[PDB]
Nucleic acid binder design. Structure first.
Lengths: 199, 291, 130, 190, 106, 171
RNA sequence: CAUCGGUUUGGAGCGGCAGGAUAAUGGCGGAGGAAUGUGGCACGGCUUCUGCUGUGUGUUAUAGCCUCUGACGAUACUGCCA
RNA sequence: CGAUGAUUUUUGCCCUGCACAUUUUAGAUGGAUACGAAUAAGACUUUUUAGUCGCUGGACCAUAGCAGGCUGGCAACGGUGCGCUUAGCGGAAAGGCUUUGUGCGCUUGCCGGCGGAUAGCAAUGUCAACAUGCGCGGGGAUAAAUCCUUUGCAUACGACUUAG
């Protein structure tokens, strides 16, 4: 609920449209939102059904000049961006400013790779879909419709995960030392009083 | 209503827009896929179309009526003086495509390639690459640092090579400088090969063999503004047509109330960038040969 | 051997202790459907509720017959000492801690900050040397 | 109808140690080890004892319940594949042109090569799955033996061989030529 | 020390409106940390300041303020209706306001 | 709807020929006494030569549940109209109150047969004392000895929009 | 800022009273009955009988449940408070 | 969108330490507080049996001092800021993350002494980051493009390929 300066949303496991609606309402209200790992988003419905939906989307182009028509972006970040822009009054100055408040990425590039990523429970697939239902991963659909950088993104993601695991090992080592020191300095007058206060 | 009679359309939609090439030098859109097992070798070369000639050859094609019989064939000559390696570029894989990371130049550049960086050479102080050449001050550690960066981070290594146009009969003094992808070996091997070849000449004999199939990248012959009859090969109208006959009679139906992009219009003809494939190398001749 | 990893679910059974309104303890006395149960307790009114409005706790009241009336549930609840078992869990401790923090005034919040400063000084001193 | 609970009991023979963890079943037996992911099914496993395992579905509808005995059968197939093996015997059926079948190895990969099928000049090459053994039997003429621990791989190679030898543009009631799976059984006869 | 704030942060969300017609005289304010009408009722009657910067100086200050007050709650999610002396300009949709803690009733 | 069970008693308006008319009683499930008295006349005019104008309502009384905190199984006999014809069914419900089982019935037939409240007549609501009186398997399965079941995949309703920790569904 | 008057929106509002089956329930007492039968008893499969367990028997035992009822005492709900 | 070359002998340009003054803000007012994966699962301890944890961030860190002054002491040799300084890692958009030594502070870990009024009972009661300009200071470098003539691999004219 708090007004954060930037909210970085880890897009893994999130349903496309529900996340899009929440993020649209957020950025219309003046909140800066950065969605990372847009290749890990999810769409309800089997893979083939969503591929057919995208092919129906591709069928639409300006007859007299194909360069004027809708521009079908294949990248997962751009698919999420299309979903969000559909939910924004983008043809006004206010909508344009609201769209300037949003960033979408595949993977977690710098500088967000060392920041805090949060999730949105109201849009999480594992919390929303009935457990037997089928779903699509937006990265696979993007590869199926012409996105060219799935292998590069997964390589960079595995490298980033190796780095992040090393960081986490260091952090977990450091916090364990602090917990040991806090336990030693317990049962003192400062510690005993802080227990009576609920701390 | 439908056409009374069916016919294929005139011209290809796969070569639009029929506009002038942005540069007179053809650029290699795609390079052969890199195989690490192969030895480190170049993938492209630059030459000059000299002209066409005629050869005679015994055809070796079993089952053909011309098998073991002479055939007269047209051939094209490409004057290819050796190219000089002057630089190396490293390219890094990104989610947004290949991105050049680092360019390392040779210590010394010939004047004909330094002219490439000038629109008015005769009025210049000719300051190009002077501070960069000074960067080789008795240790060249900045160059080694950049080369180490290319080795560590780059995934595609290309070499900057220029032609020795002074060896050709052309009056142009600017050399042509181009990026040629290096295939084979690891990135370290490619960078070592590029460094060991700075300021050296590379001949066509080390790039192309005889009897190879190669592709040609070039800008075609220009013709200027051209009408639909020659630009697209449409049918001329009858002799008795008012206001002329080298036209397309119907440029569209009433709806869409626009002119479609697929209708033939007059415009610029020729001088297009074209890639032609599967040309057999009949001969690799040497300039030192007197026969 | 086989070594099958088994789930550690909480079951909907007669005798489960449940939190109602995150304030009261009750127990399931009878199962109505997949979604609805009947709950009873010393400090809650015997009623039919939906399982989405309650939370199952890791505590089971043993040997509680199905459909037991209020007196039986009260007697067996006292016998098993459910309140003491519940108040001993980290869950109940965290709750009571939450209300205790909620009751603080500005003065003792200031006191909390001061004591935190003292304890942090002591903890850092202990941490640097071990 | 949302049945409250449905159960199956898997029986584990003496020499087999089934190992389940996060719906990744690992079955070990004298003939080797097999593994299977069942992450697409919401089932839970309980070890009744060393010889019996309970497979349960809670509050499952008709299709969710139907997906339970298939799980049981798949794990049972894994069990019987590491203790008895799987063997498919195929016949060569032809009217005029003998079918020439070879077990060749190209590019470090084994292939089954069918030649002279219906007199065709085309040569049919079938990739062999890992863990599957192809053999030309000695005991009987015009035979092929597909052996392996995994029923799925063995049956799929048999199916690929059968499907690659199909007749086109003919009366298949009349041109019955082909390679057909005649016997499905175990390596250790019972 | 590092914190000096005596007000609650808010955001100017919208005007009172139907689908097609807006009423600039009533502004909808999102108070930070409020999510229910019961919580938002603590702030009824409290004063709101919209603080902005202007080009010209007035008595050496480039900061101007529009004062308002919280009048009633709006909806079910803890928004409130605010009435300012001069209507908040539409360009402030998404801008931050200050919910002052007075007139205090604690 | 949210219903109650009402006793409605009525009779023909007394005549000099017929000075003590017979009293008729019905059990009506209605949200309020205005509908309860309306439904009463609806069923008398389907069974007897009477009207609201020529009749009289004697008494309307709420019938409270005898044992509101005892789990029962109710058998309900129905007569509902589809788009094509009129059908009878018999359905069973588990509930603690007689009224709520009827409330479940109305939700049930709306869901499974698109039958509106106006399309349904309740012929009879009966408590099933014995276990062998149960005919439908969707309630028979909850009468088994020592019935246990978990609630896998618990979804926790979040107050805030953003959670800093990964979600979990344990329970 | 305070107080007033008019209009109006609320409170986790608090209290008193009335009605109903003078609520129905519950708690207590009494009587009767049964099973999704507690203990016990008899057969069993794994348990050094380690909530052991299953199946039979039967009627409160080392659990309890249901129906009727007798004297109380509350609450819900709907109204009223000048 | 990137890499690279050269960037005016002009009092013009680049980097940098400042100082002052300005215009602007789609909108600072303690902290964007960094594993990954699964969810019919996770993490501990023994034991692979069993026990425990969660059931929301109402958290964690930070938070006392004229918007935070001037001083004194006790205790420990810590914490923290700034400035140099050592080394390493990070190329996806790295422009950041750690790290050595040192100097100057401050320290609310504990105890003191002195100061705040009158802005009058509220009036945002003005305290931030980005940018720009100008005055200095220390450093550093010392170009091209177009028109014109020419060419014809080009061409309606522009443009283009050349040469000067």
């Amino acid at each position: 609920s708090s007004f954060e300066k930037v909210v970085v949303i880890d897009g893994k496991g999130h349903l496309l449209g529900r996340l899009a609606s929440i993020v649209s309402k957020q950025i219309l209200n003046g909140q800066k939102v950065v969605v990372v790992r847009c290749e890990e988003l999810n769409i309800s419905g089997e893979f083939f059904r969503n591929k057919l939906k995208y092919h129906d989307y591709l069928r639409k182009a300006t007859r007299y000049n194909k360069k004027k028509g809708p521009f079908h972006f294949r990248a997962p970040s751009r698919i999420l961006y299309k979903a969000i822009r559909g939910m924004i009054p983008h043809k006004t100055a206010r909508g344009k400013a609201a769209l300037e408040r949003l960033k979408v990425f595949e993977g977690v590039p710098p500088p967000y790779d060392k920041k805090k990523r949060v999730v949105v429970p109201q849009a999480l697939r594992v919390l929303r879909l009935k457990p037997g239902r089928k779903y699509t991963t937006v990265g696979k659909l993007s590869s199926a419709v012409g996105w060219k950088y799935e292998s590069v993104v997964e390589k960079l993601e595995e490298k980033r995960k190796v780095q992040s695991a090393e960081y986490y090992a260091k952090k977990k080592a450091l916090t364990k030392k602090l917990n040991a020191a806090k336990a030693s300095t317990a049962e003192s007058e400062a510690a005993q009083k802080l227990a009576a206060f609920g701390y | 209503s439908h056409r009374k009679y069916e016919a294929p359309r005139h011209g290809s939609l796969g070569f639009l827009p029929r506009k002038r090439a942005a540069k007179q030098r053809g650029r290699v859109k795609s390079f052969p896929k890199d195989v690490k097992s192969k030895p480190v070798a170049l993938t492209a070369f630059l030459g000059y179309k000299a002209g066409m000639t005629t050869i005679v050859r015994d055809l070796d094609r079993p089952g053909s009526k011309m098998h073991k019989r002479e055939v007269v064939e047209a051939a094209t000559v490409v004057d290819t003086p050796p190219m000089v390696v002057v630089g190396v570029v490293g390219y890094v894989e990104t989610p947004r495509g290949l991105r050049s990371l680092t360019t390392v130049w040779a210590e010394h550049l010939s004047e004909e390639v330094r002219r490439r960086f000038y629109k008015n050479w005769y009025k210049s102080k000719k300051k190009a690459f002077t501070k960069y050449s000074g960067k080789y001050a008795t240790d060249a550690k900045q160059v080694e640092t950049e080369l180490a960066r290319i080795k560590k981070y780059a995934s595609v290594v290309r070499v900057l090579a220029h032609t020795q146009i002074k060896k050709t009969p052309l009056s142009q003094k600017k050399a042509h400088l181009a990026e040629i992808q290096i295939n084979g070996g690891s990135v370290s091997d490619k960078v070592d090969w590029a460094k060991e070849h700075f300021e050296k000449e590379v001949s066509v004999d080390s790039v192309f063999e005889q009897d190879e199939m190669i592709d040609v990248i070039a800008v075609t012959k220009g013709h200027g503004f051209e009408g639909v009859t020659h630009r697209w090969g449409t049918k001329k109208l009858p002799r008795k047509t008012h206001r002329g006959l080298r036209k397309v009679a119907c440029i569209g139906a009433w709806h869409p109330a626009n002119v479609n992009w697929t209708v033939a219009r007059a415009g610029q003809n020729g001088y297009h960038h074209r890639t032609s494939i599967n040309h057999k190398v009949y001969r690799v001749g040497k300039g030192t040969d007197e026969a | 051997s086989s070594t099958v990893k088994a789930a550690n679910w909480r079951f909907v059974e007669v005798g489960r202790v449940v939190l109602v309104d995150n304030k009261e303890l009750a127990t399931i006395v009878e199962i109505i459907d997949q979604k609805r149960v009947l709950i009873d307790g010393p400090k809650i009114q015997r009623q039919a509720i939906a399982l989405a409005k309650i939370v199952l706790t890791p505590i089971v009241l043993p040997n509680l017959p199905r459909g037991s009336r209020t007196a039986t549930v009260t007697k067996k609840w006292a016998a098993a000492d459910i309140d003491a078992k519940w108040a001993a869990s980290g869950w109940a401790k965290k709750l009571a801690n939450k209300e205790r923090r909620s009751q603080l005034s500005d003065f003792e919040r200031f006191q909390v900050m001061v004591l935190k400063k003292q304890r942090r000084f002591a903890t850092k001193k202990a941490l640097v040397k071990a | 109808m949302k049945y409250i609970q449905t159960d199956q009991i898997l029986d584990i023979p003496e020499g087999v140690t089934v190992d389940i963890k996060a719906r990744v079943v690992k079955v070990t037996g004298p003939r080797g080890e097999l593994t299977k992911d069942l992450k697409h099914i919401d089932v839970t496993f309980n070890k009744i004892n060393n010889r019996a395992i309970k497979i349960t579905v809670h509050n499952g509808d008709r299709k969710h319940v139907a997906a339970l005995r298939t799980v049981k059968s798949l794990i049972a197939n894994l069990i019987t594949g590491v203790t008895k093996g799987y063997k498919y015997k195929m016949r060569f059926v032809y009217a005029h042109f003998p079918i020439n079948v070879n077990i060749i190895k190209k590019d470090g990969q084994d292939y089954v090569e069918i030649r002279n099928f219906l007199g065709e000049k085309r040569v049919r090459e079938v990739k062999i799955h890992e863990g599957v053994t192809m053999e030309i039997s000695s005991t009987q003429k015009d035979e092929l033996i597909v052996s392996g621990n995994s029923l799925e791989a063995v049956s799929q190679n048999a199916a690929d061989i059968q499907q690659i030898c199909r007749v086109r543009n003919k009366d298949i009631r009349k041109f019955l030529d082909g390679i057909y799976v005649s016997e499905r059984g175990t390596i250790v006869e019972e | 020390a590092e914190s000096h704030r005596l007000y609650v942060k808010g955001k100017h969300i919208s005007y009172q409106r139907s689908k097609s017609v807006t009423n600039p005289n009533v502004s909808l304010i999102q108070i930070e940390g409020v999510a229910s009408p019961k919580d938002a009722k603590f702030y009824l009657g409290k004063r709101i300041a919209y603080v902005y910067r202007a080009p010209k100086e007035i008595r050496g200050s480039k900061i101007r303020v529009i004062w308002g007050k919280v009048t009633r709650t709006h909806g079910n999610n803890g928004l409130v209706r605010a009435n300012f002396k001069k209507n908040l300009p539409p360009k402030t949709f998404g801008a931050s306001v200050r919910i002052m803690l007075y007139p205090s009733n604690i | 709807s949210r219903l109650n069970e009402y006793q409605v008693i009525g009779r023909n308006l007394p005549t000099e020929s017929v000075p003590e008319p017979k009293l008729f009683r019905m059990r009506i499930f209605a949200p309020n006494t205005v509908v309860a008295k309306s439904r009463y006349w609806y069923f008398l005019q389907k069974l007897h030569k009477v009207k609201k104008a020529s009749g009289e309502i004697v008494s309307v009384n709420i019938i409270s549940e005898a044992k509101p905190t005892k789990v029962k199984t109710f058998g309900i006999w129905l007569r509902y109209e589809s788009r094509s014809g009129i059908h009878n069914m018999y359905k069973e419900y588990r509930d603690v109150t007689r009224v709520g089982a009827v409330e479940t019935m109305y939700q049930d037939l709306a869901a499974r047969h698109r039958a509106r409240f106006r399309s349904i007549h309740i012929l009879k609501v009966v408590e099933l004392e014995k276990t062998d009186d149960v005919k439908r398997q969707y309630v028979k399965q909850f009468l088994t000895k020592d019935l246990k079941f978990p609630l896998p995949h618990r979804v926790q309703k979040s107050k805030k929009l953003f959670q800093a920790t990964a979600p979990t569904t344990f329970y």
